[PDB]
Amino acid sequence: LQLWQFLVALLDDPTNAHFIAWTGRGMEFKLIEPEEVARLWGIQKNRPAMNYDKLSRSLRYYYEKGIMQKVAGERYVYKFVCEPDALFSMAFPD
Amino acid sequence: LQLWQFLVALLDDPTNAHFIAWTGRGMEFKLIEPEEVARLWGIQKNRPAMNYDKLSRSLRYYYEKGIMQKVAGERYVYKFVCEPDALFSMAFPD
DNA sequence: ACCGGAAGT
DNA sequence: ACTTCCGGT
DNA sequence: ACCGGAAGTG
DNA sequence: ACTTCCGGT
């Protein structure tokens, strides 16, 4: 499982909406409890020392892959990119 | 490779523009020469008797998964859906 | 061309 | 995760 | 918080 | 494709 795959898994389950949920506008999501999310992702890839400062780095790595952008001004809020280039790197991550 | 991945791959190479290309209207794409795409897709799956009548069926299958929609009235034209529901189906196809 | 149910891999 | 068939629109 | 350039990763 | 570290604004 990749990071975005795991995030979608949490975003799709309504019982996680108290620490992570879709905003409603397009493909935009917010990390209500950023450390709660980082902890679960730490359990996933078995990285017990995983924090939000390290998880946000990978989200910033998605900027170069062009599959994510930072919603400026809104804290803990990111979004997926609606472009063919985004869907390309999505299907094939080199 | 899944069908939606195979299409994007062809859609990225500009030397395929005579039988498949994006339109510019967001995530909208057109299969200019359907049977040519079905031939190349039939090769991928080692099913040589593949045609557009069966490829388009899997495209209509993608409707229920929510990752695709038909641009009505526009012949050979489909599009990708930019919504959380679709993004969930790409991360978890079953 | 496009649709969508049903049976199959 | 599509493939195969197909009658209706 | 958010950024991102560098080195290490099984 | 991240993880770790951290000195940037």
Residue numbers in the entry:
A (entry chain V), B (entry chain J): 341 to 434
Paper text:
The Ets transcription factor family consists of 28 genes in humans containing the evolutionarily conserved 85 amino acid Ets DNA-binding domain, originally identified as a viral oncogene (E26 transformation-specific). The Ets domain is a variant helix-turn-helix (winged helix) structure, comprising three α-helices and a four-stranded antiparallel β-sheet. Here, we present the crystal structures of the Ets domains of the entire PEA3 subfamily (Etv1, Etv4, and Etv5) together with the structure of the Erg family member (Fev). Furthermore, a new Ets dimerization interface linked by a redox-sensitive disulfide bond is identified, and this dimerization is shown to result in a significant inhibition of DNA binding, potentially linking Ets transcription factors with cellular redox regulatory mechanisms.
Etv4 and Etv5 DNA complexes were crystallized using oligonucleotide duplexes that had nine complementary base pairs (containing the same consensus sequence) with a single overhanging nucleotide on each end, which makes favorable interactions with neighboring DNA molecules. In all the DNA complex crystals, base pair stacking interactions between neighboring molecules allow the DNA to form a pseudo-contiguous helix that, in some cases, runs the entire length of the crystal. In all four DNA complexes, the recognition helix (α3) inserts deep into the major groove and provides multiple contacts with the base pairs of the core GGAA sequence, as well as with the phosphate backbone. A comparison of the structures of Etv1, Etv4, and Fev in the presence and absence of DNA allows us to identify conformational changes that may occur upon DNA binding. In Etv4, in addition to three residues Arg-397, Arg-400, and Tyr-401 adopting different rotamers, the C-terminal end of the recognition helix switches from a 310 hydrogen bonding pattern (which is the form adopted in all the other ETS structures) to a more canonical α-helical hydrogen bonding pattern, although in this case the difference may be due to the fact an ethylene glycol molecule is bound in the vicinity. Analysis of the contacts between adjacent molecules in the Etv1, Etv4, and Etv5 crystals reveals a conserved potential dimer interface that is distant from the DNA binding surface and is present in all the DNA-free and DNA-bound crystal forms. Dimerization of Etv1, -4, and -5 is mediated by the homologous cysteine residues (Cys-416, Cys-422, and Cys-449, respectively). Similarly, dimeric Etv4 and Etv5 also bind DNA with affinities that are 2 orders of magnitude lower than the reduced monomeric forms (note that the Kd values of the dimeric forms are rough estimates, as saturation could not be reached). DNA complexes of dimeric Etv4 and Etv5 migrate at a lower mobility than complexes of the monomeric proteins, indicating the presence of a dimer of Etv4/5 with one or two bound probe molecules.
